[PDB]
Structures are given as structure tokens and as C-alpha cells.
Amino acid sequence: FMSSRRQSVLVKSNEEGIQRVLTSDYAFLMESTTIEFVTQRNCNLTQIGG
Amino acid sequence: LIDSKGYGVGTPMGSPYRDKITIAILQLQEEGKLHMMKEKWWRGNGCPEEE
Ligand SMILES: *[C@@H]1O[C@H](CO)[C@@H](O)[C@H](O)[C@H]1NC(C)=O
């Protein structure tokens, strides 16, 4: 998917990636420690999956 | 969308006027010339759905 959808779903920063989840149905992939920081500071986000 | 490709103004192999059209197209996208043309040809009849 990501090879076919470059400059569409491939954001270049974490702050614009969390915002893209905050706008559309976006399922951003990143490191687990920062997700444990964002989810505890934002009650509209969650960590699904292991 | 399934794929993501694009149309393009074709030039011969190694042409100098490829670069001037490259500058020209991006000028008309920011001032909205192409979107006034895309709404002029692909529209033309306001439909009914509204339900
Ligand atoms: C989701 O999180 C905040 C804090 O819980 C909430 O107030 C708001 O509705 C959402 N934030 C947005 C939409 O930026």
C-alpha cells in the first residue's frame, strides 16, 4: 500500500501524523513509547494491537 | 482511488522547454486556473441526488 500511496498516506512528521488521525480515518504506525505518551495526554486516541 | 498516476505535457527526449512548462503548470495550480477549467468541462449540469 505505502509504495503505491507515497505522498498520500506517507506523512513526514509525528505532529502532522497524529493530526491526520485527528482528521481522517488514519492508522499511523510509530514507536510504542510515544503512543503511550500521546494516549495518556489525548482521550480521543488509543493503542490497538501489541 | 486504486492507482495514482498523472497526465503530462509530453516533450521530446532532453528538451529545454520541458522545464519552462514545469514552471508554468505550477504557477496555474496556485492561482487556480486549472480548477476553474476542470469545473468548466467536467461539470455543466447540476444533478439531482440530494437524498
Ligand atoms: C479529542 O480530545 C479532546 C480531549 O479529550 C477533546 O476535547 C476533543 O473533542 C478532541 N480533540 C480534537 C477534536 O482536536
Curated annotation (Swiss-Prot), chain A:
Binding positions for L-glutamate per the UniProt entry: E31
Tissue-level expression: Highest expression is found in the olfactory lobe, piriform cortex, dentate gyrus, hippocampus, granular cell layer of the cerebellum, and in caudate-putamen.
Protein modification: Sumoylation mediates kainate receptor-mediated endocytosis and regulates synaptic transmission. Sumoylation is enhanced by PIAS3 and desumoylated by SENP1.
Compartments (UniProt record): Cell membrane; Postsynaptic cell membrane
Effect on the protein upon substituting N44Q: Loss of glycosylation
Domain of life: Eukaryota
Coiled-coil parts of chain: none
Glycosylation, residue list: N44
Purpose of the protein: Ionotropic glutamate receptor that functions as a cation-permeable ligand-gated ion channel, gated by L-glutamate and the glutamatergic agonist kainic acid. L-glutamate acts as an excitatory neurotransmitter at many synapses in the central nervous system. Binding of the excitatory neurotransmitter L-glutamate induces a conformation change, leading to the opening of the cation channel, and thereby converts the chemical signal to an electrical impulse. The receptor then desensitizes rapidly and enters a transient inactive state, characterized by the presence of bound agonist. Independent of its ionotropic glutamate receptor activity, acts as a thermoreceptor conferring sensitivity to cold temperatures. Functions in dorsal root ganglion neurons.
Family: Belongs to the glutamate-gated ion channel (TC 1.A.10.1) family. GRIK2 subfamily.
Assembly, per entry: Homotetramer and heterotetramer with GRIK5. Tetramers may be formed by the dimerization of dimers. Assembles into a kainate-gated homomeric channel that does not bind AMPA. Can form functional heteromeric receptors with GRIK4 and GRIK5. Can form functional heteromeric receptors with GRIK3. Interacts with DLG4. Interacts with NETO2. Interacts (via C-terminus) with KLHL17 (via kelch repeats); the interaction targets GRIK2 for degradation via ubiquitin-proteasome pathway.
Note: The postsynaptic actions of Glu are mediated by a variety of receptors that are named according to their selective agonists. This receptor binds domoate > kainate > quisqualate > glutamate. It does not bind AMPA without coexpression with GRIK5.
Protein name: Glutamate receptor ionotropic, kainate 2
